[model samples]
Target chain A: CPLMVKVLDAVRGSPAINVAVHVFRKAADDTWEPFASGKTSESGELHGLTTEEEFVEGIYKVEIDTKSYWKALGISPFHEHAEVVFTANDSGPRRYTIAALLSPYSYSTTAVVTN
Target chain B: CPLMVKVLDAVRGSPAINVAVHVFRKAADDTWEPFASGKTSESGELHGLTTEEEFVEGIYKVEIDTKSYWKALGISPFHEHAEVVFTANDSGPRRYTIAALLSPYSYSTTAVVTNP
Candidate 1:
C-alpha cells in the first residue's frame, strides 16, 4: 500500500526555541528549488507537515533559523543556522524516516526511506 | 543562562512505524565513524538524542534503517534507509533542534541551533 509520511514532535519539553526549516530540491540545472518550509513545534521538533506544498525526488537541502530562535529569547550568538543536505530517490519504495539533534549551538539530521 | 537542547516528538499519531537512526562523524582523513544511534518513536519520528555520548565539531552523516520498520509490519520495502550529511561548527552558541518525518514510505530532517 502507498503511504505518506509527515514529521511530528513530542509535545513535551521546555519552551526551548523554534527553528525554521527550509527544504530545497536540486534541479537538473544544478540550481536549488524550494520544496517545503515550516517551523519546529513548541518542543523544538519539526512535528509535521513542514509544507503544504509537494516534494520531488532529488538532492534536498535544509536550513535552520537558529538566529531567530535565539533572538526571540534575547540571547546573542554567532552563526545564524545550520544546513543539512541529502538525496532521496523518487523512483524507489515508499517508507522514509528523518531525524535530528539540536542545541543552541549544534545540530544534526538524517533521512531514512524504505520500500 | 546556558541551556542544553534535546530533540522531542509529539505524543499523537498512529502505529505507523519506527526507523533506526545511525550517526557518524567524518575524520580529517575522510572516513565515517559511528557516533550515535537510536530508534524512532512509534510515530516514525526520531524524537531525541539518538546517542547519549558527547558530540564534537565535525561533519556528520546519518543513516536510517527502513527495512526493519516495514518488515515488522510484514511489508516489504525496496530501499532500507536514506542518508543525510551535514557540517556543524562546534565553536558556537548552545541551543539546537533536529527533527524528521517517517512514514512506512518516506522521510526528511532538519537541524536548528541557536545562541544563548
Candidate 2:
C-alpha cells in the first residue's frame, strides 16, 4: 500500500477506533476527486487505500472525520474535520504513514514518510 | 500561564527545535489579531504566551513557521506554514497544550485542554 493512516485519541491516550477517513486527489480543475474511503479498524489504522502504481504523482487530501467520533463518545469537539494535504511523490515514489492525535478540543497530525 | 505549545519533527522523529510560533486571537470583527509570539525551545516546547487572566475565552490560532525550519535543514518543504485554530474556554477556564507534528510536506496539530 502507498498510504496508511493511524489515529489516536489524546483524551483516551489510545487508538481512535472506527473513525471515518476519506481520501481525495486534486483533479485538473482543482476540485477534489474522490479516491478512496474507509474507517479505522481495531488498531486505529486503515490501509489499502491505494497501490503504488495507482497512487501516481499528485496532490492528495486525507480528511478524518472527528465530529462524529466525539459525538458518539458524548463529547463536543471543536474542529469540523481534521485534514492533511500534501504533494505526494514530488521527488520520488515513497511510502507514507499519517498519524493523528485527537482530543475533544484539539488534535495533532503528523506524516511519516520514507525518504 | 495558560497556553503552551510543543512541536515535534516527523522527518527527524524528534522535537522540532527553534520553530517560530505566533499566536493570534479572533477579534470581534472576525479578524485575526496578534495575541502573543515566541519560539520553541531546545525541548520543543513553549509556554508563558499568556497569563491566565489575559487568556480569556476566545478563538485562537497558532501558526508555526515550518518552512524556514525545513529550509535551514537543507530540505525543501511544502506548506507555507502549519496552523491550528480553535475556540478556547467556552464553558470554563482551562489550560491548553497545543502539540504539533511537522513534516516537510505534512503536519499534525492537536490540542490537549483541561476540562473545567
Candidate 3:
C-alpha cells in the first residue's frame, strides 16, 4: 500500500480533472528532492505516491502546478503553486490519504490514515 | 452602490482571467434567470454586478463558464459550469461582494458586504 493525494475543486465540490502533481522527499541537506510525479485522473486523484511495496516513514511533500493548471483555462493565478508537507510515520497504516481542497485564492487539506 | 462578484482560480489561489461570466435574476417561473454578466480582470474580480446606481434586494444568480475557461488551456474539465444563488437584502452598506473560487471541476463562493 502507498499514500494517495486527492485534488478537489473547492468551488464546485468535485474532482479537479487532468492536473499535474509532483512529490518530493526531504534530504539530509535539508533541500527538497523530487521523488515521484504524475497527473491527476478523472477522479482528481494520484495514488501510490509513496511506496507501493511497503510503507516507509519519512518527510514527504506534494506539489501541485496550479499555475499551469489555470493557465490552460486562460487564467493567471494569484499563487503559482500549492504544496503539502507531511510525515509518513511507521504507525502501520497501510494506506494514507491526503485530501486537498482548492480554490483560486485558497486551499485547505486534511489527512486520513487508514489500514 | 451595487453588488459585486469576484472570480478566482481555485488551484492557483488567483483570479480567473479572461473567462466569460453570466448573471441572472430569478424569474417567477422558477427557472434560473440572467441579470448581469462580465469577465474577471487581472485582479480576478468583477465589481458592481448588481446596481451601481442603487442597491436593490432580490433573488440573484451567477454563472461561470468553467468549461470554456479550461478549454482555453487545452484541457477538458470534469465539470462544465459553476453557479451560485443567493438573496440580497435591503439592508445598508450599499455594496455587496460575492467572492467565487473556481477550479476545473468545482467552485465555492463567499459574500462580503461593505461600503468600500
Measured as a fraction from 0 to 1, the native contacts recovered by model 3 come to 0.73
lDDT of 1 at B39: 71
CAPRI tier of model 3: acceptable
Binned by DockQ into CAPRI classes (incorrect, acceptable, medium, high), candidate 2 is acceptable
The candidates, ranked best first by DockQ, are 3, 2, 1
Question: Best to worst by lDDT, what's the order?
Answer: 2, 3, 1
lDDT of 3 at B8: 75
TM-score of 1: 0.40
True contacts kept of each: 0.00, 0.42, 0.73
- Which candidate, 1 or 2, has the higher lDDT? 2
TM-score of chain B of 2: 0.95
Q: Please write out the lDDT profile of model 2 over residues A84-111, one tens digit for every residue.
A: 7667867777788888888886676767
**Candidate 3, lDDT over the whole model:** 0.72
Q: How would you class the docking of model 1?
A: incorrect
Model 1 chain A, poorest ten-residue lDDT window?
A1-10
Leading candidate by lDDT: 2
As for DockQ, the candidate ahead, 2 or 3, is: 3
- For B1-116, candidate 1 gives per-residue lDDT tens digits of 12112222222244334567787778889878886677766545454543223555666666656556556767554334545455554665343344544443333344455565
